[PDB]
RNA sequence: AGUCUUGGAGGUAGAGCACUGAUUGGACUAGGGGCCCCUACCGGGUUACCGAAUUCAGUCAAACUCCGAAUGCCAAUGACU
RNA sequence: GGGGCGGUCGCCUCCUAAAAGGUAACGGAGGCGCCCAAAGGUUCCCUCAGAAUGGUUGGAAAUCAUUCGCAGAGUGUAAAGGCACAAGGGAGCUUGACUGCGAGACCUACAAGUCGAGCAGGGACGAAAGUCGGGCUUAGUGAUCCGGUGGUUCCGCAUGGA
RNA sequence: UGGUGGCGAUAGCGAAGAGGUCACACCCGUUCCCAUACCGAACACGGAAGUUAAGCUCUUCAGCGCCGAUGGUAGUCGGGGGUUUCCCCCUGUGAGAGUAGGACGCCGCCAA
RNA sequence: GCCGAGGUGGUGGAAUUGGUAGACACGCUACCUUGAGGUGGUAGUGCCCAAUAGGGCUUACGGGUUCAAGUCCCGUCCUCGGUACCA
C-alpha cells in the first residue's frame, strides 16, 4: 500500500434502525444505517407491505 | 521554430558543440554536460 | 474465468530476454539461478559446450540449512557455488540472474559469490 | 493538326542504392569488411558478424564467410577463422 | 457493363498472352460451356453481347454463369495526339482470355438449346471458341 | 473480516458438495472486484475527473487511477488522452468488506430496488452491478453530492462456467 | 579465361490464394427496404426485394506472395584446357 | 517524339527491372527541403488491433473486467525491407545527440557518399556482463570564393606590437 | 523428477486420460527488503494448514498446423522451324499445386 | 484541346487564417400598425423524424488524409478567364 495516498481504515460498527449490528472496516469509525439488508423488505422473503398491497383490482363489483 | 544551437562551456567558455532545439518547446537556455577537450573531462555546457 | 499464466512462463520469457545479451563462453561460464518456493538452485554453465561445470543447491544433505528460502540459505548456497568454482577452477564467472530481479535471494547469491571470490 | 497535351506527373525516382551481398559463401574476408548491404534485416548477423547503424552486415575478424539459416524461415551471415 | 468497383492502379501494363489458362479450363458450375481456342482481350461489351445472346436464345435461363470478369483496364491516348507526355487516360476494362478457358456456362437446359446459345455467344466473341460438355 | 469466515466455513463445503468437485481447489473464489467509474464529462467539464477521484477514494480507500482514453474520438469531441474515468481494482480483505457494504448496507438504498438482474453474467462466470446514483452506502454524504453520477462494479470470480458463479453470488448475499 | 564439381546471395517465368487488392455462384444470416395490421416508428405478420460478416466451391494481379525455377552472378576447391 | 505553349530540373521508396548489382522514356505511384531535450542512451519491466458477451449517463463506437486473438496493431513521417528475444508499449536514472581517431570494406569518372571492429581520454545506465559516437533502416540538402563569430606553445615585409 | 541447452511446429495447436511422501507448483499471510499511476493480481519477504483440480510431467490421436517425396506438367538455358499479340520440335534442367507417406519429440549437461 | 479559378439555404454571396455553423443583406413565415394592401416594426428561419428535449443527412458529386475535411488530396460533370502559335 502506498503511504500518504490512501485514507485511513478503522473498524466500522455499522448499526441499523431495526437494531441489527454488523461489522466492516471503512473510513468512518462508526456508521448508523436506517435500512440494512435484514430491515429492507426484499431480503425478508415475500415482504409484508407491498406484496400484501399489490393485489390488482378484482373487477370491483363489490357494491 | 527550430534553431541552430551552440553549447558553450562554463569552466572554459569555449563553444565546442552544436545541436538544435526548439524556440517554443525549449524557450529557456538549455544546458548539458559534455566533454571539453581543453578541460579533458565532462563539463557543464550552456547555450550561447 | 479469470486465468493466470504461471510465474514460470513469464519467468522463462524474462529469462530469455536476459539470455540474448550474455552467454556462457569459454573462461566465462554462466552462473544461473533457479528460485523455487521450497529450495534454491545455482549452476555454472558453459553455453558453448552445453555443460554445467559446478552446481550448488539448498537441496544438499551435506551443509544443510533450516529455513531454505531465507537470505542465509541463499548466502550458503552462494558460498558453495564459489567454493566448488574454486575447487574446479573456472575462477571468473558471469552472473545470470535468471528472469528475476537482482533483489533478494538472487542478490544474496550474487553478493555471497562476490565476497567468496567469484569475479562477476 | 497538332493538339497540345502535357503533364505526366510521374517523372522522378531516387538514386539506386546498391544493396545485397558484397561477399560470398566460402569467400576469404578480412576484418571490418561489409558482407551484406540491406534495409531492415533480411539476413541477420551471426558469429563474428556485426550489424551496423545502417544495418549493414560486416565481418569482425578475418576468415571465411558462411550463409547458413536461422531455423524457420530466416537467414544468417557468420565469419569463421581458418 | 461489368466493372470492378475499385481498382488499386488505374493504369496497368498491357501484359503478355502466353501459356494456357491457370484454371477454369473445365466446366463445373454448369453443364455446358464455351472454351477459347485462342488468346485475346475480351472487353466489357463482348461479354455483354454474348450474355444477351445467351439469355435471348434460352428465353428463360437456368443459370448463365459468367466465369471471366474484366479486371484489367486498358488506357488509350486521345485521337490525333503525338507520342509521349505521359501515359493516356484509362478507357476500358478487359478480361484477359488465355487459350482453354471456359467463358460462359449453362445448366438445366437441354443440349441443343445449349449448342445454339453458346453458338450465338461465340459469334460475338473475337476468339475461335469450342463447345464443351461436362466430364 | 466476517465475509471471509462466512465464505470459507459455510460456503466452501456447501458449494463443494453442491457441485461435487474432485478437489478443494476447484471451488470458485471471488478473486477481485473492479470498480469502474467511466466519467466521460471530462471534455466539457475539465474539473469533473476529481469528482470520483475524490469519491472512489472514499468508496474504497485504494485510490483509483485517473484512466486515459486510448484512442481519439471525433464524435465524442475527444483526442487520445485527456483522461476519462476512474478505476479501482480490489482483492484482499477490504473487498469482502466492500461486498459487506453492498449486500448488507448499500443495496437497500437503491430507491427503486427489486430483483437486480439474473441476466448480468457474461457466459464465463463474472458479474457487473450497474449503479446510477453515487450515494448508496452511507459514507457518500448528500452534502458533498451534486452530480449523481453512478458506477460500474465488476465482481470477478474464478468460476469457469457460469451457473456456479450464480450459486456463488447467491450464497454471498446478492439478491436476484 | 573456359568447363565440370561444391557452397551461397537474390524472389523473376511459372504457380497459388496463406496476406493485400479485384471478383462469379450456392447455403444461411443480424439488418435495410416494399405489402400492410393495428398502432407510443412500438409490437409485429409476410415475402426468393437487397444483403454486411461466417462457410463451401471457383477466378485474377507489374507495384499480391504460403511457394519457387531455368539461367545469369559471387565464390572456393581440385581437375584439365 | 520539330520549336513555341504546358510540365519538369536536386534528394528518398516501390514497380518498370528480364530471381547479383546495374539499367531508359514528357513510363506508373507516391514523399522530402523536417520533427523529437524525449520520439536519444541505458536499466528493469510487457504485449497489440479487432470481435463476442456482462454492463448507467453510453449511442455503432469513450471508460471497465471478461475469453478468442504468435499479429489484422504499432513502428514521428512516404514507400520498401524489418521487427512481438522487440526496433512496438510503460517507469527510474540520465546526455555517448562525446573528443582524437580508426585496421579494413562498400560505392563511385571525379567531387563526394555510406559502414566499421578496435584503441586512448573522459563519462551515462547497470550489481555485473556489457551497451551507448542520436533516433528502425533508407529522404530532411548544396561545392568553392568572400565575409561574420569563438579559440589558439602559427605567421607578421628592419626590430617590438598591431 | 527439477533446472538448463541445441535441433526448421516431424517440437505445434486441439481432444480425452493418470500422478504426487520427495521435486516443481497452486497455496497461506504481509512483520521487515521491495512493489503496486490502483492492489501482496504481479514483484518481493516469510511460511508449510491442503491441493492434484491449473501450470507441470506421463500416456495416447492424424481433426486443423507442420515436414513431404516419385511421376507427370507449366516454365526455361542452347539449337531450329512455322500461318510469328504467338506456337511447335530436339538436348539438358525443372517447379508450384495435388498426392503416397513422415510426424502429437529427438538430442546434450548437472542436481536429486 | 491545355492551363488557372469557382461550384454553398429559394437569392446574391462571406466562411479559404485549424477544430463542429450551413453568418451578413434579400426574399419566406407568425404577429403588430393601417379600412385594406405597400413601406415600416417585433420574433424565428436548410431538411426529416421528434410537444421542447434531442440524434443524423448535408458545402456539385464519388473516393482517400485525419480523431476530425467546406478548406488537405485525387477523379467525373458543369460554368468562368487565358492559350491554341510557325509554315
Is the Cβ atom of E54 within 7 Å of strand G at any atom?
no
The verdict on whether residue A39 carries a ligand-binding annotation is yes
We report the CATH number of the domain holding residue C38 as 3.30.420.100
Q: How far is CA F173 from CA A18, A44, F98, F155, in A?
A: 19, 12, 12, 13
Q: Alpha carbon C72 to chain centroid distance?
A: 15
Q: Are D58 and D33 in contact (CB under 8 A)?
A: yes
Query: Which nucleotide's C1' sits nearest to the alpha carbon of E5?
Result: G22
Please identify residues in chain D, positions 31-70, with a C-beta within 7 angstroms of any atom of strand H: 31-34, 37-42, 50, 52-56, 58, 60
DSSP D3-50: -----------PPP---EESS-TT-EE-TT-EEEE-SS-SEEE-TTEE
| Domain limits, chain D | 19-82
E57 inside domain: yes
DSSP chain F: -HHHHHIIIIIHHHHHHHHT-SSGGGS--EEEEEEE----TTTT-TTGGGTTTTHHHHHSSSPPEE--BSS-BTTTTB-SBS---EEEEE-SSHHHHHHHIIIIIIGGGSTT-----S--B-SSSEEEEEEEES--SGGG-GGG-SS-EEEEEEEEE--SSSHHHHHHHHHHT---
- Option in F1, F62, F97 nearest A6 (CB): F62
Largest Cα span, chain C: 53
- Option in A7, A14, A35 nearest F109 (CB): A35
- CB-based burial label for D44 (10 Å; 0-12, 13-18, 19+): middle
Query: Which set of grid coordinates corresponds to residue C18?
Result: 536476459
The candidate with the shortest Cα–Cα distance to D60, out of D26, D25, D35, D39, is: D35
Q: How far is the C-alpha of D24 from the C-alpha of D36, rounded, in Å? A: 9
Instruction: Quote the DSSP letter at residue E87.
Output: P
Query: Which set of grid coordinates corresponds to residue A24?
Result: 466492516
Q: How far is the C-alpha of F50 from the C-alpha of F41, rounded, in Å? A: 11
Q: Residue E38 — φ and ψ, nearest 5°?
A: -130, 180
Is the Cβ atom of E80 within 7 Å of strand H at any atom?
no
How many structural domains does chain C have?
1
E6 inside domain: no
Residue to test with chain C: of F34, F158, F162, F168, most C Cβ within 10 A: F158
E42 inside domain: yes
Contacts of F152 (CB under 8 A, 6+ apart): F35, F36, F37, F38, F128, F129, F130, F131
Q: How far is the C-alpha of E122 from the C-alpha of E35, rounded, in Å? A: 10
3-state SS class at D65:
strand
Within 13 Å of residue B12, how many CA atoms lie on the same side as its CB? 20
Residue C92, domain extent:
21-120
- Option in E80, E86, E87 nearest D3 (CB): E80
Q: How far is CA F6 from CA D69, F14, F27, F40, in A?
A: 62, 11, 15, 38
Q: How far is the C-alpha of F79 from the C-alpha of F69, rounded, in Å? A: 8
DSSP lists the bridge partners of residue D63 as D29
Q: How far is the C-alpha of C109 from the C-alpha of C33, rounded, in Å? A: 8
The verdict on whether residue A9 carries a ligand-binding annotation is no
C9 inside domain: no
Give alpha helix (H) positions in chain A.
Answer: 49-53
CA distance F74 to chain A (A): 35
Instruction: Quote the DSSP letter at residue E94.
Output: E
CA distance F141 to chain C (A): 35
User: What method was applied to determine this entry?
Assistant: cryo-EM
Amino acid at each position: 500500500m502506498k503511504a500518504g495516498i490512501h485514507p485511513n481504515f478503522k473498524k466500522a460498527t455499522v448499526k441499523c434502525a431495526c437494531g441489527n449490528e454488523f461489522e466492516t472496516g471503512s473510513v468512518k469509525e462508526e456508521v448508523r444505517v436506517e435500512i440494512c439488508s435484514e430491515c429492507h423488505p426484499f431480503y425478508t422473503g415475500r415482504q409484508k407491505f407491498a406484496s400484501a398491497d399489490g393485489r390488482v383490482d378484482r373487477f370491483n363489483k363489490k357494491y | 521554430m527550430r534553431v541552430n544551437i551552440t553549447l558553450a562551456c562554463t569552466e572554459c567558455g569555449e563553444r565546442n558543440y552544436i545541436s538544435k532545439k526548439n524556440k517554443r518547446n525549449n524557450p529557456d537556455r538549455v544546458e548539458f554536460k559534455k566533454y571539453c577537450p581543453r578541460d579533458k573531462k565532462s563539463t557543464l555546457h550552456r547555450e550561447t | 474465468m479469470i486465468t493466470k499464466t504461471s510465474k514460470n512462463a513469464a519467468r522463462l520469457k524474462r529469462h530469455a530476454r536476459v539470455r540474448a545479451k550474455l552467454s556462457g563462453t569459454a573462461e566465462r561460464p554462466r552462473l544461473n539461478v533457479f528460485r523455487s518456493n521450497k529450495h534454491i538452485y545455482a549452476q555454472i554453465i558453459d553455453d558453448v559446450n552445453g555443460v554445467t561445470l559446478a552446481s550448488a543447491s539448498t537441496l544438499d544433505k551435506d551443509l544443510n540449512v533450516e529455513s531454505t528460502g531465507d537470505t542465509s540459505a541463499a548466502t550458503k548456497v552462494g558460498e558453495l557455488v564459489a567454493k566448488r568454482a574454486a575447487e574446479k577452477g573456472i575462477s571468473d564467472v558471469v552472473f545470470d540472474r535468471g528472469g528475476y530481479l537482482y533483489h533478494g535471494r538472487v542478490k544474496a547469491l550474487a553478493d555471497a559469490a562476490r565476497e567468496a571470490g567469484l569475479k562477476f | 493538326s497538332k493538339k497540345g497535351v502535357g503533364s505526366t506527373k510521374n517523372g522522378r525516382d531516387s538514386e539506386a542504392k546498391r544493396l545485397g551481398a558484397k561477399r560470398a559463401d566460402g569467400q576469404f574476408v578480412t576484418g571490418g569488411s561489409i558482407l551484406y548491404r540491406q534495409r531492415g534485416t533480411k539476413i541477420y548477423p551471426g558469429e563474428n558478424v556485426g550489424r551496423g547503424g545502417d544495418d549493414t552486415l560486416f565481418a569482425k575478424i578475418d576468415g571465411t564467410v558462411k550463409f547458413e539459416r536461422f531455423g524457420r524461415d530466416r537467414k544468417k551471415v557468420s565469419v569463421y577463422p581458418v | 457493363m461489368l466493372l470492378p468497383k475499385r481498382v488499386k492502379y488505374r493504369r496497368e501494363h498491357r501484359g503478355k498472352m502466353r501459356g494456357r489458362a491457370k484454371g477454369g479450363t473445365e466446366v463445373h458450375f454448369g453443364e455446358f460451356g464455351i472454351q477459347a481456342l485462342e488468346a485475346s482481350w475480351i472487353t466489357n461489351r463482348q461479354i455483354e453481347a454474348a450474355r444477351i445472346a445467351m439469355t435471348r436464345y434460352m428465353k428463360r435461363g437456368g443459370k448463365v454463369w459468367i466465369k471471366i470478369f474484366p479486371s484489367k483496364p486498358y488506357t488509350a491516348k486521345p485521337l490525333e495526339v503525338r507520342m509521349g507526355s505521359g501515359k493516356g487516360a484509362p478507357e476500358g476494362w478487359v478480361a484477359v482470355v488465355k487459350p482453354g478457358k471456359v467463358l460462359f456456362e449453362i445448366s438445366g437446359v437441354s443440349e441443343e438449346v445449349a449448342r445454339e446459345a453458346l453458338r450465338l455467344a461465340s459469334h460475338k466473341l473475337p476468339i475461335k471458341t469450342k463447345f464443351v460438355k461436362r466430364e | 473480516n466476517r465475509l471471509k469466515e462466512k465464505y470459507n466455513k459455510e460456503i466452501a463445503p456447501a458449494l463443494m458438495t453442491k457441485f461435487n468437485y474432485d478437489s478443494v481447489m476447484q471451488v470458485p473464489k471471488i478473486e477481485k472486484i473492479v470498480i469502474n467509474m467511466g466519467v466521460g464529462d471530462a471534455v466539457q467539464n475539465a474539473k469533473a475527473i476529481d469528482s470520483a477521484v475524490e469519491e472512489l477514494t472514499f468508496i474504497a480507500g485504494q485510490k483509483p487511477v485517473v484512466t486515459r482514453a486510448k484512442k481519439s474520438i471525433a464524435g465524442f469531441r475527444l483526442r487520445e488522452g485527456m483522461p476519462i474515468g476512474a478505476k479501482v481494482t480490489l482483492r484482499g480483505e477490504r473487498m469482502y468488506d466492500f461486498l459487506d457494504k453492498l449486500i448488507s448496507v448499500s443495496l437497500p438504498r437503491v430507491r427503486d430496488f427489486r430483483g437486480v438482474s439474473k441476466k448480468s453474467f457474461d457466459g464465463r462466470g463474472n458479474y457487473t452491478l450497474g449503479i446510477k446514483e453515487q450515494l448508496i452506502f452511507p459514507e457518500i454524504d448528500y452534502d458533498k453530492v451534486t452530480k449523481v453520477r453512478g458506477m460500474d462494479i465488476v465482481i470477478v470470480t474464478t468460476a469457469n462456467t457460469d451457473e456456479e458463479a450464480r450459486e456463488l453470488l447467491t450464497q454471498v448475499g446478492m439478491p436476484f
